[model samples]
Target chain A: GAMNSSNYAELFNNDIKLFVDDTNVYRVTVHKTFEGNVATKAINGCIFTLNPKTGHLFLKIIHTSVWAGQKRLSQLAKWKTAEEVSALVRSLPKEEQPKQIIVTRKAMLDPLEVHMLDFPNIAIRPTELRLPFSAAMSIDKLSDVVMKATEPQMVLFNIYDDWLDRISSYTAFSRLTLLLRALKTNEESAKMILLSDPTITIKSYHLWPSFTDEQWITIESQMRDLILTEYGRKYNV
Target chain B: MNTVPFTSAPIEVTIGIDQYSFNVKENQPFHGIKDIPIGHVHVIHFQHADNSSMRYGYWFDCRMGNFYIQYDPKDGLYKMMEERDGAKFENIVHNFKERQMMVSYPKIDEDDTWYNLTEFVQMDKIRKIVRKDENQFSYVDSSMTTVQENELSDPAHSLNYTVINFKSREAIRPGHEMEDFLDKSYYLNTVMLQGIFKNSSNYFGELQFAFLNAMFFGNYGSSLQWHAMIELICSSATVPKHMLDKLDEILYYQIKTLPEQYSDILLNERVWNICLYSSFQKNSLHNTEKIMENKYPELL
Candidate 1:
């Protein structure tokens, strides 16, 4: 059995972090945890921890420079294969050898055996594994699925996979983690911003940068405008 | 709530990524093609506004930029929409100059982060966000780019758009690919001005210096730097001879003295790198080889 949302009843802080579930395809989620400053916008990453008794996984978002990771990733030369690098390592003069030189090649086994995708996000968007759906509709389909069930059933999906596409998943954690952490606990308005707008069709695509609170009056008005103009339905949800 | 009260700041918008600029003693709506020798798709910076924010608009310096009709149509209600084969849309890629310009500003800025809108904002993004959908595009990054300076000179020839009047006649013939005209063999006699552009863009984004220097030095793998130094000094006497001389007098000094002036990320290496490098040399009837080797060796 998995731990229910109430077990984590309060967020000690307002800071939020996002990351991908390393093991699962759609096992993405966001987490809300304590940081000294609860007002500033930020992100965190944490090592995953599995609850042995409850069979639940807990994640923490670590706040560090995301670009440092990007720079490191970019600076790493695009070596062809691990085997090739290993061969080259052997050919080097004995004195030139370092204490340790590890080679992790890009998967390049059989050109015909593996298929290259147009983009990585395409794989997760239309997944068939658990017949998961994160349709960008204004309504939450999970609630609808629960109401129709004969018995209490839990619907599972990863928020991080979606976050990876929109924001850099390689950089941060999933929005689902943020939403869960927010829902089960007291969170800041900015941190819980994603929770208020769960529907995929939320038209947050304006060129205005991340909604500044000073612009909250504008954001709320715009959100209402979106609901009325786009969906042709008032804020029913 | 207090209003921000918008005013005309005479904002700038980038059209194509080529190095083109001009100074107006009087700033007004400008539209005319002259042989003034400054060559590039005409880019103009004009004032712009949206429903909310007041920022610069990036567009080509042509009619489209002035029309206040944004590259992304859904910025406001003023840009009336049309249904193209069922989807509410506007025709943008139709105009040759605009198409050339579109390729220039490949990256567009929006929501504070830069996006390669050329890759993202097409029929797909438009359809998902604009067409039939309620989401509206508040702005496109291409709107704020400006043409700081302009240069149009060649040794044996100034790019003879003397047929400028006939630009309208340049029909969109099927299979009319920019790549086709800019072939390696097509410019066997003339230097591959395009291939040189491709390589330079690889080095730097579209700063004026990179674009102009790549064009001038890119003698299609010829040994000379070909920055019009030789042509300005030597090739002035020929019938088409006066072009090299005139360019030398006016253009060479500029390239020599100043090449670093503008800073725009979207206008960087990608814009002209592909189009200029991939194609666009004078047809053989132009007698390009004879013009280059015998007539304009001094220009190279």
Candidate 2:
């Protein structure tokens, strides 16, 4: 079994802590743990933990800031391969080095590869390796999705937007973390905010600065107005 | 609660990233005004010197500062900025500007913050010429912003329409991209001047002397300090030319080290005098035009 990246992040208090699981060669789940800011928070000498149960050893290299990670990025720097990470890792001192790591077959350093993804109190799961749909949207693109939203949805969207614009938070990542946390706990209100926001449309948390809550709120209202006034489904219909 | 961000099918994303292109999560094309990064766009309310205040809007970028725009309908900069293709969305960006406009607007007693530039621009009242040269100017435009603000792509020249004459014209054409240091100063001054031309007259006076001085004396590779001193001194002629000469000489003694040839040119009084004289020479072109009319009146 594997732990979700969100859970992995919550469980970690100290920087160099490690977790051992009964080695699951399906360890591809291990690589799944580094989503959103999980990579920044999860690993310094970003390593792979093989669930080989022999404390599936991992090697790690702490070089690079934001652009280096194991994924398929096309515009920024390319994601590092396990062998590439290993090459980066081997360059470091032996004391900082670990033994092996587990990554994707595409990002695999060798044929003998291994990974896990699970979450607690989180409906979104890595417990079952699933992730297939993708649709990219920006604040502008996020609007059409809201154009399809109902009136009550717009009101809730306004509340979500109000907090998004008014409150002060640490970073865009943490802010989104908090906003998403709020949306989930708010129960009824989160749906429309997500429907109107691009981040929720694609389910991809972007590296964008905090949402211009003012703009989003205004934008959603305009679409709602458009739906009601021009389309007339909002009132008389 | 899901205790997790809402998710559907498994998610996958591209790795590359930058401010341009849809290659990464943020690099996507078509951002609304709100999505542009950091203190960039807003509709500001400038309290006029005439007890009449109104809304004016603009944006900032690394290359451009406090830029304004108006829709020209035909190849308008707003067309480039764009009008939404959707119905009843005509004034969405503009309408929203007002909704949040009051929150950021200035009223009386905002002195600790919101320093009215009208007062700063009017301080040269020692002579009648000073008021004519500087006062009686408007800082904020009466019209609101029309299009959603986007940071990625901006046109080199911008457009606008005025109500009084029912005219559409270029609001600003900064002609600022690459420059020698002397020319760069002209650009900064042009930025200052263009603000008024674009109804952002407050841009210059709104700036604290600290930043202008910091940029003025700051080293290169970080801050060019191109505060447009030449253009500024000439616009209001706030300082006497002889005094500028002395100011130049005084400034010369202060620049101890040189970062490059640019710094050397920067410290030289002659460079400043040359730019100052160039404007005076150009301002006299009207006189030259009149002389031509007098010299060749035989045809009339």
Candidate 3:
């Protein structure tokens, strides 16, 4: 009852094949609530991640800050006055500085202080919000299922240059650079058109996995792994 | 592959001039205009983008379209010459209700001629030519030919020979005299023109498409396309004074709308502070001022 690999496999199989209880997943808003340090608060607007090996669901959120300006109604009217306020904010001391501090300065920082504002309305036309359960399944056998399903319809948008550098350093992959170059140029450089594709769209955007028998299998398989790895009597902590 | 559908429209007919105010009818307050020839034209000044000292004049034409020529007394004469193809240039909304937007291009046909007429003879004239390169599509220089000897495969190395930019002192084709024109004024003018006017309908649509493409598709050069669109719109038709004011209003609105789009307080504050402190002075609304105000108000 606690952790069954067979149960995980069965669930993964049934979920992916059938169209039961799947949301077309147009825009995914990942509201991450980090308790303290290593746990960082992030909002992955258009990403969703799935681990076939252990049924671990994850999301990648980008960073943005323009949201504060919307509430400044009265001050916005005075353009020249706003300039003065800006100068004052810049001159604020360390204690008075406008900072988004959450944890111990080192371990808590989102290593990649990047975020994004979800423009769902703009993206609505491009997506169909009814995904099949099959697409949602994370079969252990087909561990790299997410990549297989979303390559063509996937693309990343509004990525910052600094974060791109950080990600490249972490992943040791030059594709992030390629992605940066691709953003500046058109498809002539990179063939990335749709940011919501199955393979490339990224995991944070997976508001909900598409439901289907195969996806179900994938998820169940991973879930079983999760149970056995941590919850099962085998790996007793 | 050929999945697009085409539609048909009614034929267009042109008629000769019916009534002519041939006689110089004398009005008390207004002076009578004497137009003896068919080509006699009056230039209209619709400053899409204006600074403290000068204004960009758009001389509207009946046959040809809009013509953007800057008249800066401080700099002496009109600075740059741009041509519009079809509709006038207008701003494209990038952030929906917000003013932070992607640029739009002028709605000009590829074959249409755009005169790079400049007030200063020192500056090289630019012609917006949509040409094909070895790689794909590029905005080619009308004056420079593709360097056949250079590597056709590499755009940075190869196309560098053919592409034309303002000449600097010591460098070939250095447009040192037009340094003041290019540095801050150009984009400022473009930003203002985009924010306020309806004449740039075609430019607005193209720019909107470019902005959307850049925002959604991660195509940043869509910005260059917006500049191209502005250049085209500048020449093809005339813009009204009211349109310029309107654009200014929209730009102000965009600066105000950034925070809610991003959730983090610090991020919002960063953008908000930057957008807030952009202007150098309260009195003068120069092109450079507008550009700084629009992009980096945070760099107080």
Candidate 4:
């Protein structure tokens, strides 16, 4: 739906939480697309982390296309090069440089250091992916949900966007697992509304190809069991 | 810190059983500004060895390790002499000089204890001796070429002069020395043995770590450390000669190749580059043998 500038401004002003702290959450969404063949060009993805409070675009990680044989897909998929990362940080305005950086992956440590070497004043720590999501759910904050469950709490991702491709990526599985782990850890807010709709359809095509059909079924079964064991019929996925 | 900072010209120090004079920046500040003592034995050369004429300058603190003195240039003497508990300055300097001599003359004869054994003279004592105008030592030209007094007039361009000329006069031509060593005949000439290694293994490991740290951790010090590692590995007798050459080749290959494939490069690959030669030692080859065979077929 098309929204006006004022609507967009209002949406941007909303406070998002990624952790149990006063600082607002900034979401850096990474999307990867593989053609699996030379005919269709592979799209690595773009990274954008926005600070809603200050309305400062802190990060814009634009991935460049690399030939499959020439470069490893894992390297292409993950933001690998420290020099490039350093260049991005170097280009940022002096005041905009973050005092602290929280990375989702351990692999980012070395690349983060490339810029940190120059601007050594800042301290960056790994958020371990799950902790941030748990913080976003207000799991550690409010003990109960509000009466109006329709109110949105935080921004989220839709993994199974491609209808043709039944098999999702490892990245999608990782995000799913991370979310599940986050919910499992926090008991009080485990019953909090994650989405407005109670019944959401995610099919077999949404599963990752790296794991076999049997493995995917086992993982899904395990996740369901884990949630059931944690919530005890309070909520259903 | 020394009571007196060394603003005076360089003094003569016994280098390779011969006394040659060179300028010592007595107050060479550690960390650019902090007046910490480099009590660590420094082995310097009179000139770039690529230039036909070569000479050596050996200088060390009488006290090393914990009992070192920090010199400040504002004053003429040491500002402070730091002696940690149970620290003996005399022993450390003595040990350092012996180690320096061993590396300097790696092929010394069994009967030649004289080469390794010498009087442990402190920098303070040496400075005192020079300031007092003692005739205990003599200064002679170590160069093969003879020069007229006219050539000696210009300190910067002079080919023939005293120990003073070796250190003070030759400061103008310092830029091309390292470049010349790296570019031309680095392995063959004196570039490798310019410094002494008290512990070759530790120093070499630091260089490898620095290179990796700079690659991954972005330590800028890695640039100098990598160069030092290459030079020391070339000069060192710790590893066998043939194997050392192969190790050098492997290091150069990794240095040249790894950056291009920085994407998705494994930690194992980086570790393999540093530990290749060491892995060959004492039959600890294990899986590295297969790695060596697959990765560096030419080396095996």
Q: What is the DockQ of each candidate?
A: 0.01, 0.00, 0.01, 0.01
- In candidate 2, residue A95 scores what lDDT? 55
Angstrom error of the Cα, residue A114, model 4: value is 1.7
Tell me the whole-model lDDT of each prediction, alpha carbons only: 0.25, 0.27, 0.26, 0.34
Q: Model 4: runs farther than 4 Å from truth? A: A1-43, A48-64, A67-69, A76-88, A127-129, A132-237, B1-273, B277-300
Candidate 2 per-residue C-alpha lDDT over A1-237 given as tens digits, one digit per residue, 9 for 90 to 100 = 233444433322222222211111111112324353432232122323322222122322223343335343221111233223334344547554433232322222211121111111111112222111011112332324333433212111111222334443223223333333433333234345545556533313322223455764554454444434433533565
lDDT (tens digit, per residue) of candidate 1 on B225-294: 2222222122112213333233223322333222333222112232222222322321211333333334
What digit string (tens of lDDT, one per residue) describes model 2 on residues B127-233? 11112222221121223221111111232211111111000012112221111111233323343334332322233222222121222223121111223333343
Top TM-score prediction, candidate number: 4
Where does candidate 2 chain B have its weakest 10-residue lDDT segment? B1-10
Could you tell me every candidate's TM-score relative to the true structure?
0.18, 0.15, 0.18, 0.29
Q: Please give the lDDT score for candidate 1.
A: 0.25
For model 4, residues B1-300, the per-residue Cα lDDT tens digits are 211112222222222221112223422221111122233222222332233233322233323423233334464223223445443544554454444422222322453222111112233332221232232221112222212334334333222211111111121123333222223223222322223323333334334433433343232333334444554343323454554544443454344433434423322344344344542231333343455556555433
List iRMS for all predictions.
17.6, 25.8, 17.7, 15.2
- The TM-score of the first chain in every model comes to 0.21, 0.23, 0.17, 0.36
User: Residues A40-153, candidate 4, lDDT per residue (tens digit)?
Assistant: 343322232333233232222222323336444444333333333444456667775555554545555544443355565665455433323323323222212211223323
